[PDB]
Design a protein around this ligand. Sequence first.
Ligand code: NA
Ligand code: NA
Length: 482
Amino acid sequence: DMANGWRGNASGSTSHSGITYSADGVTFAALGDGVGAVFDIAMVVNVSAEFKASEANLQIFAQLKEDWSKEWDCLAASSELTDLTLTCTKFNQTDVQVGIQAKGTPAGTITIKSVTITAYSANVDHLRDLAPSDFPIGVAVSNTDSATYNLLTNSREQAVVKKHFNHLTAGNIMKMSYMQPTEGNFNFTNADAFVDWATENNMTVHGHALVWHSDYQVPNFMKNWAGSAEDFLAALDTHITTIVDHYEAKGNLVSWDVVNEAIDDNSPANFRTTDSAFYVKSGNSSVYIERAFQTARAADPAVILYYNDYNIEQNNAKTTKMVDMVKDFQARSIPIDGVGFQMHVCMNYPSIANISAAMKKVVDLGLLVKITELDVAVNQPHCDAYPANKINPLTEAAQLAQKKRYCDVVKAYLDTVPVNQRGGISVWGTTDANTWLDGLYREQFEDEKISWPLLFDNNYNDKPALRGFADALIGTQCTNTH
Ligand code: NA
Ligand code: NA
């Protein structure tokens, strides 16, 4: 604020002549030693020719008001001056006077253009090493799809991933049109480079995803299919067989999301129709779902086959349709080894009782239960009556609520899923600086990055979320306190 609150100040015997407000900021006449300008609680400045000639220095300073003697250390010498940038760094008490003053035998004027003024540890060495049985502790990464966040070019991503995880999912580059952009032209280069790095680092890879209706990654030739239903289904088989066979041979790819998000968001729930190219191009049929599983099993009988979805942890209509599908597949000998609960949850919804009940329904059918995409939104437009209780900026209370919530979810997973049915827990991203949720809810969020849903902050430092996750793994009581 360079248009309100500024004062002339004299620390020496020479009187000041106040300040002048202009479009440039705040100016004062450097009348003598200790004459300056201050405001109440890093600068940009431009000094006059008479000031440089004077040989006088500039002193940024701060002092407690009325207890005046208590930060003399700062100094910008005349020789450092010619529009410059000047920075300055007992400070905390429960009124502070700050500014800059001329030192020496000054003359001319000083214009100040701007002024701005500006570490938690979870004490977890390696999150993966705390797992009470040998199940994957995993993370989604960016690859060539993000110039900024690509695992293979971003050394901060590499460091956090190496430190804590032992299992990886590609955020986008193993999706359908990324693997087969045009008919018959498969592209394995970038995803092979990713798998190689995982292998080099003793991490296994979860493949995401063989079949998924989301329009931006449906291959154009599939979206625009103009042939028969059976030839479409034959094309879908070729897509799956080529990719599964290839990754079987590469090694280190242990499980696939075979079909992702085939169930609608209605109540009661049904398989997707008009919004799925797979339903429409198969001739208005959901036979492609079971077929994809059969085709994937034939291509690599050892790879673990998941059906993956969101909201199936809520224990309502979507959960029911998912369970009915699994039972139907079992009754008809359609191969399926596990269910992936994406687990994109809110802070207070759905309840741990419901999440646990939903996972247990899959446990009781003898299948693996894998948490594939866990994150915990601090703000989420469908939760806690948003925006009535919007949290912005992020607070310590919300970070501690998030610690408890991560702990509660991981504990529920451990309490519900027997050792040999644990397919893993993975979180959907590393740093809050790059969560998918901020883009997904950008309209509701008014383009602000306010979901803060992951284990590490924008600087890759630990959040209490990480401590909550570890607390669950070690059987420590889940709390929202340090
Ligand atoms: Na592993
Ligand atoms: Na094969």
